[PDB]
mmCIF file of C-alpha atoms in Angstrom:
data_model
loop_
_atom_site.group_PDB
_atom_site.id
_atom_site.type_symbol
_atom_site.label_atom_id
_atom_site.label_comp_id
_atom_site.label_asym_id
_atom_site.label_seq_id
_atom_site.Cartn_x
_atom_site.Cartn_y
_atom_site.Cartn_z
ATOM 1 C CA UNK A 345 -67.976 1.883 29.495
ATOM 2 C CA UNK A 346 -68.580 4.666 31.997
ATOM 3 C CA UNK A 347 -65.888 6.825 33.555
ATOM 4 C CA UNK A 348 -66.237 7.285 37.302
ATOM 5 C CA UNK A 349 -64.230 10.368 38.219
ATOM 6 C CA UNK A 350 -62.482 10.990 41.509
ATOM 7 C CA UNK A 351 -61.287 14.550 42.101
ATOM 8 C CA UNK A 352 -57.650 14.432 43.237
ATOM 9 C CA UNK A 353 -56.614 18.033 43.883
ATOM 10 C CA UNK A 354 -56.076 21.516 42.509
ATOM 11 C CA UNK A 355 -53.704 21.503 39.534
ATOM 12 C CA UNK A 356 -51.421 24.103 41.106
ATOM 13 C CA UNK A 357 -51.039 21.971 44.253
ATOM 14 C CA UNK A 358 -49.226 19.176 42.392
ATOM 15 C CA UNK A 359 -45.490 19.778 41.878
ATOM 16 C CA UNK A 360 -44.129 18.340 38.599
ATOM 17 C CA UNK A 361 -42.332 15.027 39.108
ATOM 18 C CA UNK A 362 -43.605 14.506 42.666
ATOM 19 C CA UNK A 363 -46.063 11.636 42.647
ATOM 20 C CA UNK A 364 -48.988 11.418 45.049
ATOM 21 C CA UNK A 365 -51.222 8.498 46.047
ATOM 22 C CA UNK A 366 -54.929 8.873 45.269
ATOM 23 C CA UNK A 367 -57.830 6.692 46.438
ATOM 24 C CA UNK A 368 -60.589 6.141 43.868
ATOM 25 C CA UNK A 369 -64.283 5.653 44.652
ATOM 26 C CA UNK A 370 -64.025 1.834 44.560
ATOM 27 C CA UNK A 371 -60.864 1.687 46.670
ATOM 28 C CA UNK A 372 -58.358 1.400 43.803
ATOM 29 C CA UNK A 373 -55.027 2.982 44.742
ATOM 30 C CA UNK A 374 -53.430 5.217 42.172
ATOM 31 C CA UNK A 375 -50.041 6.909 41.704
ATOM 32 C CA UNK A 376 -50.684 10.366 40.211
ATOM 33 C CA UNK A 377 -47.960 12.471 38.555
ATOM 34 C CA UNK A 378 -47.866 15.872 36.838
ATOM 35 C CA UNK A 379 -45.085 16.243 34.228
ATOM 36 C CA UNK A 380 -43.159 19.282 32.958
ATOM 37 C CA UNK A 381 -45.232 19.314 29.760
ATOM 38 C CA UNK A 382 -48.263 19.921 31.999
ATOM 39 C CA UNK A 383 -49.825 16.469 31.596
ATOM 40 C CA UNK A 384 -51.155 14.410 34.492
ATOM 41 C CA UNK A 385 -50.863 10.621 34.500
ATOM 42 C CA UNK A 386 -52.372 8.027 36.837
ATOM 43 C CA UNK A 387 -51.060 4.479 37.179
ATOM 44 C CA UNK A 388 -51.466 1.669 39.719
ATOM 45 C CA UNK A 389 -49.890 2.575 43.069
ATOM 46 C CA UNK A 390 -48.873 -1.022 43.778
ATOM 47 C CA UNK A 391 -45.492 -2.286 42.544
ATOM 48 C CA UNK A 392 -46.468 -5.384 40.551
ATOM 49 C CA UNK A 393 -43.303 -7.237 41.576
ATOM 50 C CA UNK A 394 -43.251 -6.600 45.350
ATOM 51 C CA UNK A 395 -46.867 -5.658 46.045
ATOM 52 C CA UNK A 396 -45.587 -2.537 47.860
ATOM 53 C CA UNK A 397 -47.989 0.434 47.629
ATOM 54 C CA UNK A 398 -45.150 2.824 46.780
ATOM 55 C CA UNK A 399 -45.273 3.704 43.055
ATOM 56 C CA UNK A 400 -46.270 7.318 43.832
ATOM 57 C CA UNK A 401 -42.879 7.666 45.519
ATOM 58 C CA UNK A 402 -41.093 6.555 42.351
ATOM 59 C CA UNK A 403 -38.783 8.784 40.320
ATOM 60 C CA UNK A 404 -40.174 10.188 37.086
ATOM 61 C CA UNK A 405 -37.897 10.036 34.056
ATOM 62 C CA UNK A 406 -37.547 9.343 30.348
ATOM 63 C CA UNK A 407 -36.664 6.221 28.390
ATOM 64 C CA UNK A 408 -35.938 7.028 24.764
ATOM 65 C CA UNK A 409 -38.157 10.086 25.115
ATOM 66 C CA UNK A 410 -40.909 8.061 26.773
ATOM 67 C CA UNK A 411 -42.213 9.311 30.134
ATOM 68 C CA UNK A 412 -41.866 6.770 32.907
ATOM 69 C CA UNK A 413 -41.676 6.198 36.628
ATOM 70 C CA UNK A 414 -39.077 3.971 38.281
ATOM 71 C CA UNK A 415 -40.264 1.899 41.225
ATOM 72 C CA UNK A 416 -38.552 3.040 44.498
ATOM 73 C CA UNK A 417 -36.574 -0.090 45.544
ATOM 74 C CA UNK A 418 -36.499 -2.385 42.534
ATOM 75 C CA UNK A 419 -35.824 0.531 40.136
ATOM 76 C CA UNK A 420 -37.882 -0.872 37.247
ATOM 77 C CA UNK A 421 -39.330 1.544 34.662
ATOM 78 C CA UNK A 422 -43.067 1.778 33.940
ATOM 79 C CA UNK A 423 -44.398 3.842 31.010
ATOM 80 C CA UNK A 424 -46.853 6.491 32.262
ATOM 81 C CA UNK A 425 -48.918 6.358 29.064
ATOM 82 C CA UNK A 426 -49.955 2.685 29.185
ATOM 83 C CA UNK A 427 -48.525 1.333 32.451
ATOM 84 C CA UNK A 428 -46.285 -1.182 30.657
ATOM 85 C CA UNK A 429 -43.070 -2.202 32.375
ATOM 86 C CA UNK A 430 -40.408 -1.014 29.951
ATOM 87 C CA UNK A 431 -37.873 -3.460 31.473
ATOM 88 C CA UNK A 432 -40.097 -6.575 31.347
ATOM 89 C CA UNK A 433 -42.839 -6.638 28.661
ATOM 90 C CA UNK A 434 -44.754 -9.359 30.560
ATOM 91 C CA UNK A 435 -45.472 -7.067 33.511
ATOM 92 C CA UNK A 436 -47.494 -3.848 33.847
ATOM 93 C CA UNK A 437 -49.452 -1.612 36.195
ATOM 94 C CA UNK A 438 -52.959 -0.401 35.340
ATOM 95 C CA UNK A 439 -53.339 3.025 33.776
ATOM 96 C CA UNK A 440 -56.268 5.279 34.661
ATOM 97 C CA UNK A 441 -57.717 8.157 32.644
ATOM 98 C CA UNK A 442 -56.556 11.435 34.159
ATOM 99 C CA UNK A 443 -57.597 14.948 33.228
ATOM 100 C CA UNK A 444 -57.341 18.584 34.229
ATOM 101 C CA UNK A 445 -60.716 20.352 34.004
ATOM 102 C CA UNK A 446 -60.789 23.825 32.412
ATOM 103 C CA UNK A 447 -61.176 25.248 35.933
ATOM 104 C CA UNK A 448 -57.970 23.533 37.045
ATOM 105 C CA UNK A 449 -59.029 20.434 38.983
ATOM 106 C CA UNK A 450 -57.137 17.181 38.529
ATOM 107 C CA UNK A 451 -59.394 14.141 38.254
ATOM 108 C CA UNK A 452 -58.742 10.443 37.824
ATOM 109 C CA UNK A 453 -61.261 7.962 36.465
ATOM 110 C CA UNK A 454 -61.788 4.275 36.802
ATOM 111 C CA UNK A 455 -63.713 2.593 34.025
ATOM 112 C CA UNK A 456 -66.881 0.762 35.020
ATOM 113 C CA UNK A 457 -69.607 -1.101 33.116
#
């Protein structure tokens, strides 16, 4: 595995709970969120039911303490940690490594060979 990092933005430019769409080096589309605990999480931007590129516009919440985003129309919950649909175990979005560098830059990786 190699991680190919795309720099999203300055940490202090992302408001907690307000997702943003990020384009990775290979064209993958990502929904990026910062949470109240300071963490950043990147999941697939495409709703896996409708194909709508709108996940970044979803509402961040909790399900039994577990951080999630609800898709905008269909209102289905996806865990931010592993991209699993919490409402339908057979469905998921991809999850992408996401970090904040010591200097305060948010990056998102895709994994390549």
